[PDB]
Ligand binder design. Sequence first.
Ligand SMILES: [Cl-]
Lengths: 261, 252
Amino acid sequence: HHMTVRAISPDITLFNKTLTFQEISQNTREAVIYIHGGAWNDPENTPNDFNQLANTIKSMDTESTVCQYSIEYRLSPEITNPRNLYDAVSNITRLVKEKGLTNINMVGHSVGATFIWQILAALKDPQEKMSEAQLQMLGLLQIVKRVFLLDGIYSLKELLIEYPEYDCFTRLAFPDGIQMYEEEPSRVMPYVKKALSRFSIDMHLVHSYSDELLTLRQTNCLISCLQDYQLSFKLYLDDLGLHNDVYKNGKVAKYIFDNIC
Amino acid sequence: PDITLFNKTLTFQEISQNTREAVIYIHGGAWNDPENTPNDFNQLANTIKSMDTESTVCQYSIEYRLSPEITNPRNLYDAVSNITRLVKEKGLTNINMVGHSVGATFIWQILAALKDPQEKMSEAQLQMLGLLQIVKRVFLLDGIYSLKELLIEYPEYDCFTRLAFPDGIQMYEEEPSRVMPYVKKALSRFSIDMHLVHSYSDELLTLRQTNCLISCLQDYQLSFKLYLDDLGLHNDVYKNGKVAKYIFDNIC
Ligand SMILES: [Cl-]
């Protein structure tokens, strides 16, 4: 009996903080895995951020074809890039093995979308050089069907040009300089192109016109690069509320549910 | 006689017990190409019909006279008249418009109809208003939205724009930067879902037309969806199975 992952010890990477919003059952065909954002640093953003959205999806999913989980990762300033990402990768890898997830749809908001973007860029390193975390990334690419990137951060460089004030958090996640971020679109797009084609991954980009913390600049800089490399993607722009309303928004739930098909 | 070519309307999937949505297609052809016809969408529509296991969709494809014999906005007005008559004759309650090339231009022009007040609208414009009242979704495939941008990018396309705009492209009334405020009114007043589609393999149009439209949409905070892919050359886009899937999955 119980009240759903097999807790491990020690649990350095916070696998035990994984939430289940909708468990696997007889008719389950697709998995949704959520990654919360919060600027690498905000302890108020948790895997429970997506509770409302997941529950709206669970309602619409009248045949129970969807299972849904949300992962945790350690925060800056103590854990810095790419170690927060590697926690999420580690935790997702364990979850897939434990539940036998054959495929997955990744949903991320803010820095969670950043992590998914970083995973999509993993082919930047050849198999001869890949670290254990990078090999796990390759492993996830092999099973990802779609990603949904909600009001994401893709270019640290462009983020600091637009928002010098955001140094207050980026200096914590990138303590040796943001130039240490390896996944600038203009540098890694050729590898993301290879990954989406090789693994047949569908990319969905979502942004809110009302997002007070990020303008459309990040989105448009990504789109411009995606276009230049002729990567297929889908974009959805709407009034989906404030930055932290987007991952609770019923129109976002609908968008995700309707596009898992 | 059948001046506007209503009798050339094709039915791809007639109404059924179960029909809830209508799809109406408008072929393109740069205003003038007689090789584009309502059959352009036969393949796509038959694929959607097959996807539509429960017969919730009906589908029709319309015709309109070509330039140089007729010029803007009279080609549009044929399409409008023909759709209006079809809607009346079949009792179509809602509609999903799908346009390719200038067929998408037409749909865009319909979306900008509130540029004229009710007191000033012509009969064709009043018909456009009546379409706005029942349109649920539009799917704009590799369209032309700005004549000004089109000749900036391709001065050589004067060879067909001079046929449809014989007194000059300045007579085009629907430049996005000019009419976006009215499109904004329409989309909100009526709850219309806009989908923009372009092919990376389109040899006739780069992404400029699409990007110029997006920039303007974003400036007015108009909701829309975009789908970019390799969907073939310009006149193959409307036959691509990925387009068929995109449309069907988005009528929900
Ligand atoms: Cl008139």
